[PDB]
Design an enzyme around this catalytic site. Sequence first.
Site, PDB file in Angstrom:
ATOM      1  N   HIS A 198      39.012  26.673  56.857  1.00  0.00           N
ATOM      2  CA  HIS A 198      37.864  27.108  56.107  1.00  0.00           C
ATOM      3  C   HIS A 198      38.262  27.165  54.632  1.00  0.00           C
ATOM      4  CE1 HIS A 198      34.464  29.496  54.837  1.00  0.00           C
ATOM      5  NE2 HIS A 198      33.865  29.249  56.050  1.00  0.00           N
ATOM      6  N   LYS A 212      27.139  34.806  64.665  1.00  0.00           N
ATOM      7  CA  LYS A 212      26.474  35.738  63.758  1.00  0.00           C
ATOM      8  C   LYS A 212      25.905  36.874  64.627  1.00  0.00           C
ATOM      9  CE  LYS A 212      25.797  32.426  59.937  1.00  0.00           C
ATOM     10  NZ  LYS A 212      25.068  32.216  58.679  1.00  0.00           N
TER      11      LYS A 212
END
EC number: 4.1.1.39
Lengths: 439, 439, 123, 123
Positions: A275, A156
């Site tokens: 994912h 992030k």
Amino acid sequence: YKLTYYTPEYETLDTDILAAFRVSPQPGVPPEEAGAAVAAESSTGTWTTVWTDGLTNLDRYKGRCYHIEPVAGEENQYICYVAYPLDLFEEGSVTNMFTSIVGNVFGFKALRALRLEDLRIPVAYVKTFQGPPHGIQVERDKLNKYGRPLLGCTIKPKLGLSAKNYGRAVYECLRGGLDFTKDDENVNSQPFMRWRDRFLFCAEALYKAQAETGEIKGHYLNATAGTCEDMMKRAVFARELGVPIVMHDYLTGGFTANTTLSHYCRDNGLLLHIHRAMHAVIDRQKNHGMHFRVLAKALRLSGGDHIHSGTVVERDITLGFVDLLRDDYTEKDRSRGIYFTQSWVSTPGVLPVASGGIHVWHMPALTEIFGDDSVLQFGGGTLGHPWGNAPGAVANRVALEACVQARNEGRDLAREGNTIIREATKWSPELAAACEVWK
Amino acid sequence: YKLTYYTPEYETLDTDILAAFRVSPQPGVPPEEAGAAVAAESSTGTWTTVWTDGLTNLDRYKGRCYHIEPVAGEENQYICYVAYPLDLFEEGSVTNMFTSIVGNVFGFKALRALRLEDLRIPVAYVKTFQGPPHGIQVERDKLNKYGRPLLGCTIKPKLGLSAKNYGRAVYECLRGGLDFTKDDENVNSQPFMRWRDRFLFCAEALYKAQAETGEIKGHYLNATAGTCEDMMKRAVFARELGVPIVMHDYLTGGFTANTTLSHYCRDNGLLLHIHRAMHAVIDRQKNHGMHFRVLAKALRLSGGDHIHSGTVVERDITLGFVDLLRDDYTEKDRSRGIYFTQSWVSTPGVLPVASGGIHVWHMPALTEIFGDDSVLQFGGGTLGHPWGNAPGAVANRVALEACVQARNEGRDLAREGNTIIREATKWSPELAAACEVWK
Amino acid sequence: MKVWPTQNMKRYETLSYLPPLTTDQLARQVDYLLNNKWVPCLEFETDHGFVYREHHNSPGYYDGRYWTMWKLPMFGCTDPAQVLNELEECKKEYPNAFIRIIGFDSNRQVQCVSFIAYKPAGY
Amino acid sequence: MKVWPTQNMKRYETLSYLPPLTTDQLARQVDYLLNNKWVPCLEFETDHGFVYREHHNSPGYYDGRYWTMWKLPMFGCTDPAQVLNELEECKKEYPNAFIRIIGFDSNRQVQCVSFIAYKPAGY
Ligand SMILES: [Mg+2]
Ligand SMILES: [Mg+2]
């Protein structure tokens, strides 16, 4: 519709695909008609009869509603069980399996709603798919990682970092004892971070962290792309860099591209992290869509080594589909939402990945629930450590090993989890610093 | 031509390509007609009307002269502004953009002269191009070079050295602290130095200098060739050698070959240095041709990492187009010859390269003018040093770092530049020796 | 006529061809970071302080570009002395390390500075 | 704010971020193997101790994953002390070796455990 498609006397064959549908009929549509309509509209049902039907035997190709049971608690909701013959389905094509079963019926006007809860994939259909490129046992043997959950971190912010600064975070994460860092599902190739730049800097960082620590390291390189050609160019460069693991957004890329990448990964020794971005569009509402377990089973056929399986802050339902992903055989269990006994005839298991807002105090619960064959993915819980990424990583690795050690000694992680962490704070300053910040 | 093509009331669309032409009409052609003629002859204008025009709507495809202003000082010259719709242009083709705008109009007999000064490239057209293979930020990150101009040297004599002797000069250049050496624009493959030989020896030299110094080195390997096949063979061998940077003469090779090389470079991690050989044939005269800023814009779309931007020994005009190469957004500024506000929607910037006739005493001015995101290229100023190439290189590197240090301390490079160099002569004998020879 | 030496002549990019920065000169380079709203950070390396190629060979791949971060970037640093204090703490823990000051421009979204602050003896 | 060290910080997978296991702690980790019907075995290495790449560099290929088996897996071992005795015999013959205890699950048909039992001094 009623007499052809509702067949309560039908004995299911071992080659049949069985579906459990949660059926919410329109008011005054009785269950038997709803059930027949679901069968008919997911197979050979025609609105007017046609002469070409006489050139074949449609009893061979019809879906059959063979059982109906009410749902406890709900007004006007039923589980309809439908058998589809093997001959309906293209071999090795999840695309075709979904098209055949869910392509048409969910729009049928006599239903207010429709959810697919489960599928029994017969063993003869199972054997037409490659399945996971490697699966759990092989992954552990390749990575030389035994007897604990694996540990990862999503980098992030997802967008805004340069490729070099992103790689800096990867190095600092990996060197503190995380096994994996990861591309966010959104990070493909974008103006400020083109994919090949990211791949290259992530390679340098990953290899620096491996040389420093002596443990094998991986970064989930996101190969998701607009076209198959683009996806493949990305997986190819990963192969060329010698790195262990790529990733795909299997729902937004889709099953056709997913199965291509799964086959490439088996042929080139690449692990495949999957994912589940977009799952909640489909799987969230109880009345309408497809339960995740169906999406999970589909992924295990198309193939991946890891699959995002959610946070665990019902537990039983999650534990249900985790067993469906990992084990060779799972018996019917209505308390865990397993509507059918499922065999996999030695198709490898897929590692479930737990993520979301988790931190060191979650470690006992996560280890208890998932056990060893899982990946625990921190984002905030590593990067948010007050001392930076490497201490973040050390805190997580120590917390995990502390829990593993305690579990192996016979301590109850459910009862003593808090105490296990507190004890480790006495000798790990990295973990002590984390424990002040969260809880 | 008057009533269709001169439209002073026209509001330009955000999708339109805008052109600023310097228009020198023939005596007694009034401006409005000159402007309409430019628009017409760069778009839909025919000498006799044709019935096929009635099969479409020509108002959708016409160029529109929407503004005219006289030029200060010059007799009978005007800036005419023309809007071209987006739909005229092939996506990602600089070739087509130039053919559409400059292919026909410059021969029109009612004009004595015609110069294209500027283009507003709309953001929807910008996003059809790859742009630079890497661009400024990524280049700095790959080479690990921050907070100063980069330093390069052209090898001279351009023709007559053996491939080995040429590589010897490269090694001695690079080892003294130049980042780059360079092929002359003329050096392709010639009798006394075949390209593959040069590439091989330049690789040996560059890797020797890198191992000696510990700083990453490059040599701009000129891939410019007679055919696309030949150009590609050269870029491929550079890829095989693992070297960081290739070169192309984008005007003489041309935009079709340039865009092919730019895409190859993005796909294979090669930096691309772009030389503007032949620019002065087009860009020198004020009343006829195309200003360099247009050629620069075009290069930023087709793609390169570096582009030759000239010596500065008008300043404002150079600083104008340097901003156009580097920044994301540049506002119209008539004092810097920026006729239109230009956005690049995160297309990377290109490094401007200063070259020609420069030496250590130019370093304060060059650092002041260009700032850090530039390449300063010293042919004579390295190879002309009395102690040879490595001392040549040291003199340049020291003068540069002395300037950078002085600037960072708050000194004025414009006022104290001479003094900054003199101070550095006191501890660098290499720079002292250079300062005796020049100025 | 001097010959530039070949042996023990490794360099560290920007400012490494100048004499080693005095403590005052260092403080002025840190002041330049702070005046431009760049975030200073320290980075150190014990093993190889130069670039090499071990893990891969393809264009623009080099090992040895990433060093190790000392602590965190010094967000909301107002005073050069805070950087020079971390420099001293780093030298104390790693006297055998190379140490550079780097800078982050959060607006351009890149690392923007890198210069050597300390080398061990013999370099 | 502590900086995690870079130098002489090699690790050995599961349990290697904890303090070195006491004799008692070792015996409890072996008891866990025996309670699950896993077969303990010892593995040792004198040369590297870490993963590296010499012979190949394609995905999932690493050298240094295999160490050397000490004797055989200890089939029908009922008592942790028998494993600890072999550990002592191995340390006696190879004081300069890394030594880990591994476990085999004959039901899952894989190696299932690998933790470091002894490191030489300096590690
Ligand atoms: Mg994410
Ligand atoms: Mg030249």
